[PDB]
């Protein structure tokens, strides 16, 4: 975790390695900011709704600002992300283009009115596939089971 | 089962052997056999062979119906056999003793079936498919 | 062949190093008529797809054997834990 305290390629695997040793450890300092800080960085890469809000009631460790910025990107406009940023201002962890990136993932349709509007080789669009597209994800779980062998070497 | 013998019809009257050869103090020691072994006295059977003889003795199918209808099959038994594995782990978690009543000789067999099913496809749904590549 | 019903006089004769280890112009003109395939539009897409589907199958599996392997882990750990 202290190595977790820039790059975002491995902050989540060090988040899995980080969020392990705290049955009941502290109430300030060590136990607190690892979870909420690392899931904030997990939004600094851009990971949105479905691990966020129902995973909150385990900690509930003063719980205002970072969750508020998570839905401030989950919606994704600068107008109320402003008052998340400037009106709070003490939230710390100071170290904008990402909530821009969310709304322009849509487009109006694709081009957006002859290359110009605002919101505020596999001819398919990226659904699934039976070639190189889905193969990457496939060999994810295979790798996991192989790495899970370690279990057999423990008795 | 090969064994030669002697003429010990008569002559109950040398061969250090390293202590009587071993494996004829272990026959199937049965009285009519050992009473026959009074006359018999087997000794050994050696064996020869050559490398030549030794050495001498020593695809596809893809979606015909094949790949589908042996992963359309086995995943269904993984479904409801994993439901019976759920029932096994729920059930034997408590009130279990004496090696699960001797491994359920009756209603054989939950869990192992899942292991066998897992083994069957991962030798097939990879390997020759691998050679497809 | 297979040597049916008399492989007893073969499997006794298959000692040192064992079976596996046990314990471990017209015709050639018509040869290259059926060779060429890099045309990935259709065929390529199909090949991609099948691989994905079978890969998935393996991922599904390589999971339930990991689970039952973990069940053997907790069996051994509670066994030697009770042998403490």
């Amino acid at each position: 975790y202290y190595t977790g305290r820039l790059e975002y390629s491995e902050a989540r695997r060090t988040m899995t390695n980080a969020l392990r040793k705290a049955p009941q450890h502290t109430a300030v300092g060590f136990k607190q900011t690892v979870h909420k800080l690392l899931i904030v960085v997990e939004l600094l890469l851009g990971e949105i709704p479905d691990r966020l809000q129902f995973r909150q009631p385990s900690l509930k460790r003063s719980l205002m600002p970072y969750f508020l910025l998570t839905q401030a990107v989950r919606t994704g406009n600068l107008a109320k992300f402003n008052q998340v940023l400037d009106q709070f201002g003490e939230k710390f962890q100071a170290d904008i283009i990402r909530l821009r990136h969310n709304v322009i993932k849509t487009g109006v349709r694709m081009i957006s009115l002859s290359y110009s509007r605002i919101s505020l080789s596999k001819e398919m669009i990226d659904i699934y596939s039976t070639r190189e597209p889905q193969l990457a994800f496939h060999q994810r779980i295979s790798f996991c089971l192989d790495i899970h062998n370690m279990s057999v070497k423990a008795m | 089962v090969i064994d030669a013998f002697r003429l010990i019809n008569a002559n109950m009257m040398p061969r250090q052997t390293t202590s009587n050869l071993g494996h004829l103090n272990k026959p199937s020691i049965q009285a009519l056999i050992h009473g026959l072994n009074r006359h018999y006295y087997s000794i050994t059977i050696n064996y020869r062979k050559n490398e030549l003889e030794q050495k001498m003795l020593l695809l596809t199918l893809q979606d015909y119906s094949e790949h589908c209808k042996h992963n359309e099959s086995v995943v269904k038994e993984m479904l409801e056999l994993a439901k019976n594995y759920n029932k096994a782990v729920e059930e034997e978690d408590k009130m279990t003793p004496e090696q699960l009543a001797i491994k359920n000789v009756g209603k054989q067999d939950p869990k192992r079936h899942l292991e066998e099913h897992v083994d069957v496809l991962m030798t097939s749904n990879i390997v020759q498919c691998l050679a497809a590549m | 062949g297979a040597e049916e019903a008399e492989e007893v006089g073969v499997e006794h004769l298959l000692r040192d190093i064992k079976d596996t280890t046990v314990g471990t112009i017209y015709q050639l003109q018509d040869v290259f008529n059926l060779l060429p395939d890099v045309s990935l539009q259709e065929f390529v897409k199909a090949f991609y797809l099948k691989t994905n589907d079978q890969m998935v199958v393996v991922y599904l599996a390589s999971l339930i054997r990991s689970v039952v392997a973990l069940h053997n882990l907790i069996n051994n750990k509670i066994a030697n834990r009770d042998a403490e």
Partner: peptide, 8 residues
């Protein structure tokens, strides 16, 4: 993926 394609 032939290189990529531990189980034993």
């Amino acid at each position: 993926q032939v290189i990529e394609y531990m189980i034993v």
